[PDB]
Amino acid sequence: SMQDPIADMLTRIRNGQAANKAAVTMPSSKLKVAIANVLKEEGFIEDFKVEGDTKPELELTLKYFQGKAVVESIQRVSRPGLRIYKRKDELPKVMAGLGIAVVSTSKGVMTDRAARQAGLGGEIICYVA
């Protein structure tokens, strides 16, 4: 990317959700390992392998259950220059809470249940559905 590494990643993934390729790959900062170690665990994709040490870079495995593809409607919201630092008792539940809401907390990125369990919100990263 030039001027957001995480926004321009989220174009790269769901273009794989429009031709149903197997593996996708983007140049991977240490933040970017902490991105898809949430999407795997909540079940939206399957497996990933970092590789490279002068170009640290990922091998994400997609997940399309049918002709239907699992990662339906992912959206970045906090785009740079429009930071929305949510207080935690405003929190965006995604699609009546049926999805997950990736929030950049202190204690990590892994965020469904920061509403009650962790107990501190922050900058939204992206809605996920």
Binding site: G81, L82, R83
Partner: protein, 79 residues
């Protein structure tokens, strides 16, 4: 001790008196954007011990002159 408001020096063409701007973020009240806004307030100091371009710690004081109600405490930056 109030907050020890950090600021800069903009100009010194005055007799024992300086001009301080202060960096300051804010939510823009209707759009939700962060505009870096700065103010401009005259500050009393005697020794001319800070130069044009430093970084200054400031508390309030008695209103000495017109247009100037802040004394220097100390300086944390050379020119």
């Amino acid at each position: 001790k109030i907050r020890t408001l950090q600021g800069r020096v903009v100009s010194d063409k005055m007799e024992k008196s300086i001009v301080v701007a202060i960096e300051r973020f804010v939510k823009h009240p209707i759009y939700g954007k962060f505009i870096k806004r700065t103010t401009k307030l005259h500050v009393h100091d005697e020794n001319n011990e800070c130069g044009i371009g430093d970084v200054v710690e400031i508390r309030e004081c008695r209103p000495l002159s017109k247009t100037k109600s802040w004394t220097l405490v100390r300086v944390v930056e050379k020119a």
